[PDB]
Amino acid sequence: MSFVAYEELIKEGDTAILSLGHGAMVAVRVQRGAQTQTRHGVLRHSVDLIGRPFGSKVTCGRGGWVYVLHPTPELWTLNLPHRTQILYSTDIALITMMLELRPGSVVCESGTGSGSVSHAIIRTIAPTGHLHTVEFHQQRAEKAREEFQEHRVGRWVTVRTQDVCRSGFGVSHVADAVFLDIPSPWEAVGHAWDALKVEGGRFCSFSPCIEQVQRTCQALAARGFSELSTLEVLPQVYNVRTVSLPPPDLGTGSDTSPFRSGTPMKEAVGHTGYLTFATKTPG
Amino acid sequence: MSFVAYEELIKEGDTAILSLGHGAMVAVRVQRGAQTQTRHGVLRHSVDLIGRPFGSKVTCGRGGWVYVLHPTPELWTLNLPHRTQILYSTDIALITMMLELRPGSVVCESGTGSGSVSHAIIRTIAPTGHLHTVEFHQQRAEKAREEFQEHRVGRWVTVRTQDVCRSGFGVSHVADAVFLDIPSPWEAVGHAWDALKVEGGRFCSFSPCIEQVQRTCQALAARGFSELSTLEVLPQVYNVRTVSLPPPDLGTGSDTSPFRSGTPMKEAVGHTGYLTFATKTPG
Amino acid sequence: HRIRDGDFVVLKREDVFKAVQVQRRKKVTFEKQWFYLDNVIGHSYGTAFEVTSGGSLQPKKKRKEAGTDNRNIVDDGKSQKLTQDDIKALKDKGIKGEEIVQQLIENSTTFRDKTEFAQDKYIKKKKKKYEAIITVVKPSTRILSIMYYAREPGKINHMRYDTLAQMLTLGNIRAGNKMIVMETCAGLVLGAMMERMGGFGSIIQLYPGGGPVRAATACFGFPKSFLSGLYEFPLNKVDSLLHGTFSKDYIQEKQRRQEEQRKRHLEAAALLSERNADGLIVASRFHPTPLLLSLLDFVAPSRPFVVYCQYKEPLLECYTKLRERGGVINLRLSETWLRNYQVLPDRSHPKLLMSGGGGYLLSGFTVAMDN
Amino acid sequence: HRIRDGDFVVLKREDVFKAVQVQRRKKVTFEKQWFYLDNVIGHSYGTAFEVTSGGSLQPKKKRKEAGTDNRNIVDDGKSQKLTQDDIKALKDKGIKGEEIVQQLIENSTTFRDKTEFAQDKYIKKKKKKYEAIITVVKPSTRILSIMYYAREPGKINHMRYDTLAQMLTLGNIRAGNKMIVMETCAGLVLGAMMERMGGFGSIIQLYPGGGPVRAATACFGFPKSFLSGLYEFPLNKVDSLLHGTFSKDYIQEKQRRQEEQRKRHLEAAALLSERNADGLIVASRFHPTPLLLSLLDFVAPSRPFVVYCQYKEPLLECYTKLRERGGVINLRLSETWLRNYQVLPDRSHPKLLMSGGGGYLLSGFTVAMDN
RNA sequence: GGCCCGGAUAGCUCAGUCGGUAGAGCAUCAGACUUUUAAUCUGAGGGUCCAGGGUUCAAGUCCCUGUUCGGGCGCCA
RNA sequence: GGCCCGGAUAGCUCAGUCGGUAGAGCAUCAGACUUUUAAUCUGAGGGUCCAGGGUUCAAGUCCCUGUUCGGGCGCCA
Ligand SMILES: Nc1ncnc2c1ncn2[C@@H]1O[C@H](CSCC[C@H](N)C(=O)O)[C@@H](O)[C@H]1O
Ligand SMILES: Nc1ncnc2c1ncn2[C@@H]1O[C@H](CSCC[C@H](N)C(=O)O)[C@@H](O)[C@H]1O
Ligand code: NA
Ligand code: NA
């Protein structure tokens, strides 16, 4: 930690990410006297973690070992406790650039959900920016506040428990960017406009279904939004393997040599959602 | 020719396909006394084409040369005169298999358009099948009849000039398969059902817009169609090139060797249309 | 036409397929169940079924307040007011299933507070588990190619069904052709070619080992008439051919097959020697490059050939090698991506984009050689 | 905030972008036209414009019978009742353009018989050609990355904008970091990193040849404050560093730059020697494998690195080599496919699927070495 | 005493600290072969992920419990 | 006489009979260098496809005409 600044050494209260081999991993809250069990053995925090530098090989128990990684939003996204379906880093990367997020940006978000996007945004807009996020589910809202304090990023984020479609984001004409991940985003387009600065800003909505996109685009146009774009981004991941196809027996007694290939981990890439962007300008 | 049977030698009336280098090609109607100009010179049919076998290298004029290929629906699709946008062989391949087309199949189609799909179907259902196609544009309908006679496949196809959405396909309870390529296919779903055998058959509709698909699926369900599936197939074509990335100069005085790569011809693959399939069964 | 005993058949539940041959008093499993197929006869293909007591019964072909938000929906874990033990009782009691659903709904405190869509989704999830409906359909390349890619993709070198379709089209497979095929895809490609040739023409199958695999081919339920034009020839004697240097009670039955097989192989070698084939189709676990360079010699000019490979790199070499050899034109290295869609009112979107594991194709046309 | 002279800026018409710096009385071209930018000032970014006499004028931000079928629509070629000569007159006369459209419509016999959608489409086609509207927007990574991929993709090794976005995220680019970058993408990657670092931290740019390219970087319009943390160091002296073996009136100005550059290079080499960098970003026309194997040594443990390559094969080798060297974890070879959509009432569908020419990424985290 | 962690698809049984779970073995069957209540080699057939519930947007890389196999900690949660 | 075929994007000018048109050259500019009204080497900046019309589904791998560059046929269409 922190999530917003690299530190050399592991300390109490830190969220650490353990790599367990393959690509499997688990997140851990470091506390004195605490123990964590893994397939490679046990980790006693007070002696095996605390005081030690990130990126180190940590021997666990019966000679087993693990690597400990410094937390990042990307790693957090892959290890956080789901209270909702979340966005993954591929969609988040595109959202972040297309919303023109940077240090100092003021951002409004709903719904907070499980905080995957929230942490990414905070990482990007720190140290001078602020995130005003909204979640109308009391428990999810509070669980998010807890995590933000645990991760020491409360300064850069305010969670408001309310319905974004009736009561808005809780701020007006302060935001450079608005991000929506809710079932009925067309009912929030007006508040997004109100939340964005008068001088203008950027808008993005995430929707799984094309009918949600259609309604969103209709509402954006009617309210005065411009530069409407709807995109979908699809990740493909490859395994690096050496393969050798056996030569055929034609009866004969070079052109059949082994090769490196990049094969997809999965035969199919799924659909998360459509991303609809737009711009607010005066006039 | 024919389109339905391979023949060794080129003869008058044949549609021949000339390969002009690269992937460029042109179709030609072979007639005595006729001449065809290409970038590699001139072809005098009576002596350079007629009597000669397909697959041969044909010297043209100033030492230039060309290859002459036997006609197929796939080659025809790439060289036919557009009177409409047409379907290409990738969509046609999927349509053909998913409609379960085979020799002896009876097929209904609208709209005929430029006959790209028509020729593919005829090739597939010959010698015992028949195609009942429909086109409500008089000129396109007649131009299609002309081509079918020129290509000597009239036996296997009947073109009816009428509105498929009011008057149907011109047959009832005879078809194993129905294919639609029109702007308002949901208005033809009833006639498709009527056209298909009572014992059942297969249905496919091609639509560029998702709203057309939605209406089509709604109509299919209401009429009693089953096994509804909506698919999109996207072709990617690769150029085979050898590339070599120059080593960086780090100041030092193997791991930088040239390689074969398959790179896409285009940086983007376009959208033709959605293909919606369904099945008709009694009950 | 209609279902009958001895018929090869395909069973379908949701999107899951399994092929079987119908036999009186025979036990087969399908997605965690046991069937007796006897009862499914005289019924038309497309008919539906349900299990009961080990036997299948013909069922019909066919068969409101809600909330707006989940803002107050909590995961207590105490929403379903019946137990994991109570639940078995209903099945152990062998009740329909639709009622088990209705019961689960009625005993869900949250159901009424859920959105209409969330409700529809809750039901669909339950029906899928308790309302097991089996459809019986007719074998076809469509169904069998989709079945294999889902059930045994390794047996067919991960050739996706859209890729198979392209091969049939690019190779202009049709009635009357003399086709050459070299397949280790369980006979699926062979069968697909046979469907599209409809008994007209001839197919010469080159096989490795002691014989050609035709497990999938058998699922098609082809007439005997389609066999007359079907030939086979060992792949290990190909080089000889292109050089012309090619030659208590069952022991007799073994002598019969061995000589009747010898015969059929001599015919096949004659047909190949004519070097006038109308196309070449290759889809195997072997490296394609040498197969092509050899097998094309059997193909006539102005004819299409298509080579499948699960991997791209091998087809890059084959492309270059064909370019040295000459005798080909319009070489095309291709791949197809396939996307399927969920189309429902207010709930429309793509599901899966199949790519990279559907395979690659190298296609072109033969031409005359320079001399 | 608002537009001003000297400001770096981006012009947009439809989806086409071009970057330029504003100057009083300066001529620039854009999609077949000539501008004088003087008139575009005091206006807010997002403002629109039209050409007139070589000068741009501020325009507003904003500004029915039909047929069912084309069954009786014929392509006579005689539908538009005005000539290819008449048409120039309207322009040679310098009329608005909207009227040229209205005129073309009025003189189209078929327009009224066309579908509403066909009509909307006819108009859009005409407006696009006669109603040239130019928007002036603020530079950003979004806009500049999209511009470059469309206008000069070769300059950035065909790195698509979604791919650039992934690199920024996978590399956890943020304020405070000490970042190392090696780029031959005209300074676009450098600039994107600089936008996300907001002047906090440091960037060390390794360059080939006689200096680093920063043409794109300049389009961003960064404050001088962002330069204090920006360092550069020649790539040809890297090996020396990892071994410690590293050392009439303008002739003076040349001596000043050469020594002030020597200085800045010594600082940079010091920072690198600390081997405590927070990340590594590589995107070049050079083979990546040796770059990585060398440059990682400057990176601290538990830090992300991302390598771009227009081609996959080179990243396969680099993957294997990193696996021999060790010192890395969670290696990931990735690619992103991008699809854009047309969203209109009753006319919704995908347009283009960008794939294969957007590039590939190899990413992972550093770890401590075994000893 | 308990707690923590990881598994469960083919008739049976397994599967890697590289982001190694549609990959196999056993057995069975076929071909070839010789040594024949049969051996050997080669090949083939066989796959949709244990059960139940809850829950996320109208996309699960989500959660709980049960059964069972395994790893670890220690009488502490 | 005409007919047929192929081209036109950067300030200018080009681009392959493998299904070779976001690939270059000239020029310009910068760096280095020496030979300095400047040369040389290296590198960099510069791209959305000639104009007009018609037309396909609500997706152009569509068509016609004009300008201009080029190839070919022969007084025939
Ligand atoms: N009208 C509304 N106002 C505030 N929150 C809402 C809302 N409608 C839905 N939500 C909330 O929006 C969330 C969508 S899940 C979003 C997950 C988030 N993008 C992530 O990456 O973590 C849910 O938690 C839901 O409670
Ligand atoms: N209601 C209708 N009845 C008959 N034809 C119709 C029709 N509506 C549209 N069409 C025709 O359908 C055609 C669609 S273009 C179809 C092209 C065809 N699939 C091919 O590959 O060649 C048009 O020619 C149009 O005239
Ligand atoms: Na098992
Ligand atoms: Na030019």
DSSP B8-70: SB--TT-EEEEE-STT-EEEEE--TT-EEEETTEEEEIIIIITTPBTT-EEE-SSS-EEEEE-
- Pairing mode, strands D27-29 and A25-29: unpaired
Q: Answer whether C345's CB lies under 8 Å from B211's CB.
A: no
Whether D222 has its CB under 8 Å from any CB of chain A: the answer is no
Angstrom distance, B20 CA to F74 C1': 24
CB contact at 8 A, D13 and D135: yes
Contact D361, D166 (CB under 8 A): yes
- Domain ends where: A41, A72, A103? A72
Per-residue exposure over C53-77, b if at least 16 CB sit within 10 Å of its own CB, e if not: eeebeeeeeeeeeebebbbeeeeee
Cα separation of A181 and A87, whole Å?
Answer: 9
SS3 assignment for chain D: CECCCCCEEEEECCCCEEEEECCCCCEEECCCCEEEHHHCCCCECCEEEEECCCCEECCCCCCCCCCCCCCCCCCCCCCECCCCCHHHHHHHCCCCCHHHHHHHHHCECCHHHCCHHHHHHHHHHHHHHHCCCEEEECCCHHHHHHHHHHHCHHHHCCCCHHHHHHHHHHCCCCCCCEEEEEECCCCHHHHHHHHHHCCCCEEEEEECCCCCCCHHHHHCCCCHHHCCCEEEEEHHHHHHHCCCCCCCCHHHHHHHHHHHHHHHHHHHHHHHHCCCECEEEEECCCCHHHHHHHHHHHECCCCEEEEEECCCHHHHHHHHHHHHHCCEEEEEEEEEEEEEEECCCCCCEEEEEECCCCCEEEEEEECCCCC
Known binding residues of D for substrate: 70-80, 121-130, 151-158, 257, 285, 323-331, 342-349
Placement of tokens 């002691």 in the chain? C210
Residues B100, B170 contacting (CB under 8 angstroms): no
Among all strands, which nt has the closest C1' to C365 (CA)? F19
Residue C116, CB-side half-sphere exposure with 13 Å CA sphere = 5
Q: Determine the residue type at D327.
A: G
Task: Give the strand order in the sheet containing C56-57.
Answer: C17-21, C8-12, C134-137, C47-51, C56-57
Query: DSSP letters of A91-148?
Result: HHHHHHHHTT--TT-EEEEE--TTSHHHHHHHHHHTTT-EEEEE-S-HHHHHHHHHHH
Q: How far apart are CA B244 and CA B258, in angstroms?
A: 4
Instruction: Examine the fold and report which residue of A25, A53, A72 is the final residue of a domain before the chain moves on.
Output: A72
Atom of ligand 1 nearest to the CA of A86: 21
Instruction: Give the integer Cα–Cα distance in Å for C322 and C319.
Output: 5
Q: How far apart are CA B130 and CA B103, in angstroms?
A: 9
Please check whether residue D58 touches A, CB under 8 A.
no
> What values do phi and psi take at A18, rounded to 5?
-95, 130
Question: Euclidean distance between the first and final Cα of chain A, in Å?
Answer: 45
User: How far is CA D184 from each of CA B255, C47, D90, rounded to the nearest angstrom?
Assistant: 20, 64, 47
| CB contact (8 A) between residue D311 and residue B261 | yes
Strand F contact at CB of residue D349, distance < 7 A: yes
User: What's the CA D16/C1' F67 distance, rounded, in angstroms?
Assistant: 27
Interatomic CA distance for residues A88 and A83, integer angstroms: 14
* Nucleic strand E near CB of residue A42 (< 7 Å): yes
Nearest Cα residue to A121 out of A168, A175, A187: A175
Helix (H) or strand (E) holding B166: helix B164-167
In A166-213, DSSP assigns E strands to 177-180, 201-207
Choose among A199, A260, A274: nearest Cβ to D316: A260
Domain housing B105:
73-283
Nearest of A117, A115, A175, A122 to residue A145 by alpha carbon: A115
CB of C342 lies under 7 Å from some atom of strand E: yes
Task: Give the angle subtended at the CA of B268 by the CAs of B263 and B270, to the nearest 5°.
Answer: 130
Resolution stated for this PDB structure, in Å: 2.1
Q: What is the torsional sign of CA D179, D185, D187, D191?
A: negative
Q: Rounded to 5 degrees, what angle do the CA atoms B222, B228, B231 make?
A: 135
DSSP state of A156: G
What are A181's two structure tokens?
């991940």
Residues A283 and A203 in one domain: yes
Give the DSSP per-residue string, C59-126: PPS------S--TT----S--B-S-TTHHHHHHHTT--SHHHHHHHHHTBSSGGGS-HHHHHHHHHHH
Query: Does the beta carbon of B257 lie under 8 angstroms from any beta carbon of chain D?
Result: no
**CA gap B45, B31 in Å, rounded:** 6
Structure tokens at C46: 């497309």
Write down the H helix ranges in chain A: 73-79, 89-98, 116-125, 138-150, 164-167, 189-195, 210-223
Q: Are residues A53 and A103 in the same domain?
A: no
Distance CA D123, CA C119 (A): 45
Residues A195 and A278 in one domain: yes
Are residues B97 and C332, on separate chains, in Cβ contact within 8 Å?
no
C282, C314 contact by CB (below 8 A): no
Residue B212 and residue B156 share a domain: yes
In 3D space, the residue among C312, C363, C174 whose CA is nearest the CA of residue B23 turns out to be C363
Tell the burial category of B83 from Cβ atoms under 10 Å away from its Cβ (0-12, 13-18, 19+): middle
Residue recorded with tokens 């504003």: D22
For position B188, which CATH number holds? Answer: 3.40.50.150
**B233 phi, psi to nearest 5 deg:** -120, 135
Domain boundary among A72, A89, A109: A72
In total, chain B counts a number of residues equal to 283
The overall longest dimension of chain C from CA atoms, in Å, is 86
Strand B226-243 versus strand C328-342 pairing type: antiparallel
Do A222 and A104 belong together in one domain? yes
Classify residue B85 by its DSSP letter: -
Q: Which helix (H) or strand (E) holds B188?
A: none
Looking at the structure, tell me whether residues B39 and B64 fall in a common domain. yes
Rounded CA-CA distance D179/A126 in Å is 17
Question: Does residue A207 contact residue A185 with C-beta atoms inside 8 Å?
Answer: yes
Amino acid identity of residue C68, one-letter, is T
Whole-angstrom distance, CA of residue B65 vs CA of residue D290: 48
Sheet holding A57-59, edge to edge: A25-29, A15-19, A65-69, A57-59
In angstroms, rounded to a whole number, what is the distance separating the alpha carbons of residues B89 and D211?
Answer: 51
φ, ψ (nearest 5 deg) of residue B260: -80, 135
B89, B136, B148: which to mutate for ligand 2, most atoms within 8 A of CB?
A: B136
Q: How far apart are CA C127 and CA C104, in angstroms?
A: 11
D202, D226 Cβ separation under 8 angstroms:
no
Whole-number Å distance between alpha carbons of D133 and D168 = 33
Closest CA to D58 of D135, D2, D130, D138: D135
In one letter, which amino acid is C52?
Answer: T
Residue B29 and residue B47 share a domain:
yes
Classified as helix, coil or strand, C282 is: strand
Considering only CA atoms, which of A119, A40, A42, A134 is closest in space to residue A78? A119
**Number of independent structural domains in chain B:** 2
Whether residue A143 has its Cβ less than 6 Å from ligand 1: no
**Using a CB-CB distance cutoff of 8 angstroms, which residues of chain A are in contact with residue D46?**
200, 226, 279, 281-283
CA distance A4 to D172: 10
Rg (CA), chain A: 23
CA quadruple A230, A234, A235, A241: dihedral sign: negative
| Cβ atoms of residues D232 and D209 within 8 Å | no
Q: Is A53 on the interface with D (CB under 8 A)?
A: yes
Q: Which residues, in sequence order, are bridge partners of residue D50?
A: D57
The sign one gets for the Cα dihedral D108, D110, D115, D118 is negative
Give the CATH number for residue B58: 3.10.330.20
Binding residues of C for substrate: 70-80, 121-130, 151-158, 257, 285, 323-331, 342-349
Q: Which protein residue has its CA closest to C1' of F23?
A: D154
Dist. CA B177–CA B196, nearest whole Å: 6
Residues B199 and B222 in one domain: yes
CB atoms inside a 10 Å sphere around CB A242: 10
Q: Domain check: are B18 and B157 in the same one?
A: no
Is A210 within 7 A of strand E by CB distance?
no
**Are A133 and A107 members of one domain?**
yes
Listing DSSP states for C286-338 in one string gives S-HHHHHHHHGGGBPSS-EEEEEESSSHHHHHHHHHHHHH--EEEEEEEEEEE
Q: Spell out which residues of C between 86 and 105 contact strand E, using CB within 7 Å.
A: 87, 104
C31 Cα: distance to centroid of ligand 3 (angstroms): 14
Residues followed by a gap in chain B, C→N > 2.5 Å: 253
**Residue C11: its H or E element:** strand C8-12
> Which residue is nearest to the C1' sugar atom of E6, using CA?
A39
Q: How far is CA C173 from the centre of its chain?
A: 18
The protein residue with its alpha carbon nearest to ligand 2, atom 24, reads B113
Out of A209, A256, A264, whose CB is closest to C349? A209
Q: Residue D332 and residue A158: Cα distance in Å, rounded?
A: 34
Q: Rg (Cα) of chain C, in Å, rounded?
A: 27
Binding residues of C: 70-80, 121-130, 151-158, 257, 285, 323-331, 342-349
Token duo for residue C44: 């038309």
Q: Are residues A214 and A107 in the same domain?
A: yes
β-pairing, C230-234 vs C47-51, is: unpaired
- The three-state secondary structure class of C226 is helix
Q: Based on the domain organization, do B129 and B227 belong to the same domain?
A: yes
Closest-CA residue to D188 (of D359, D2, D366)? D359
Residue of A181, A206, A216 to mutate, ligand 1, most atoms within 8 A of C-beta:
A181
Helix-, strand-, coil-residue percentages of chain C, each rounded to 5: 35, 25, 40
- Helix D161-170 / helix D141-151 crossing angle, nearest 10 deg: 140
Q: Do A98 and A124 meet the contact criterion of CB atoms below 8 Å apart?
A: no
**CA–CA dist D236, A213 (Å, integer):** 51
Are C360 and C328 in contact, with CB atoms under 8 Å apart? no
CA distance C276 to D86: 62
Q: Which of D44, D162, D175 sits opposite A127 (nearest CB)?
A: D175
Q: How far is the CA of B204 from the C1' of F43 (A)?
A: 58
The Cα–Cα gap between A6 and D278 comes to: 8
Residue written as token pair 């539906």: C48
Cis amide bond preceding C345, omega within 30: no
Strand ranges (DSSP E) for chain B? 15-19, 25-29, 35-38, 41-44, 57-59, 65-69, 106-110, 130-134, 157-160, 177-180, 201-207, 226-243, 259-264, 268-270, 274-280
| Total residues belonging to chain D | 371
Tell the residue nearest (CA) to atom 26 of ligand 2. B137
CA–CA–CA angle C137, C140, C143 (5° rounding): 70
- Half-sphere exposure at residue C126, Cβ-oriented, CA atoms within 13 angstroms: 18
d(CA B89, CA C250): 51
The residues near C97 (Cβ < 8 Å, ≥ 6 apart) are C130, C131, C132
B236 touches strand F (CB under 7 A): no
Query: Tokens for B255?
Result: 């791991």
Pocket of ligand 2, beta carbon within 6 A? B 84, 86-87, 110-111, 113-117, 134-137, 140, 163-165, 181-183
Strand-pairing partners, residue A160, are A134
> How many CA atoms lie less than 13 Å away from C86 in the CB half-sphere?
8
Q: Which tokens in the block code for residue C243?
A: 């050089």
Q: Closest-CA residue in chain B for C319?
A: B240
Residues in chain A: 283
Which residue of B233, B260, B265, B274 to mutate against C (max C Cβ within 10 Å)?
B233
This entry's atomic model was obtained through X-ray
Both tokens of C314, joined, read 């091998």
Using a 10 angstrom Cβ sphere, with 0-12 exposed, 13-18 middle and 19 or more buried, the burial of residue D247 is exposed
Strand pairing class (C304-309; C360-366): antiparallel
Q: At what angle do helices D141-151 and D188-197 cross, to 10 degrees?
A: 170
**Those residues with Cβ within 8 angstroms of residue D138's Cβ, 6 or more apart along the chain or in another chain:** D9, D10, D45
Residue C123: strand pairing partners: none
B199, two tokens: 């014992």
Domains defined along chain D, listed by start: 8-59 (no CATH), 86-130 (no CATH), 141-366 (3.40.50.150)
Long-range contacts of B36-44 (CB under 8 A, 24+ apart): B38/B64, B38/B66, B40/B64, B40/B65, B40/B66, B41/B65, B43/B18
Q: Decide whether any atom of ligand 1 lies within 6 Å of the A110 Cβ.
A: yes
Contact call for residues C126 and C104 (beta carbons, < 8 A): yes
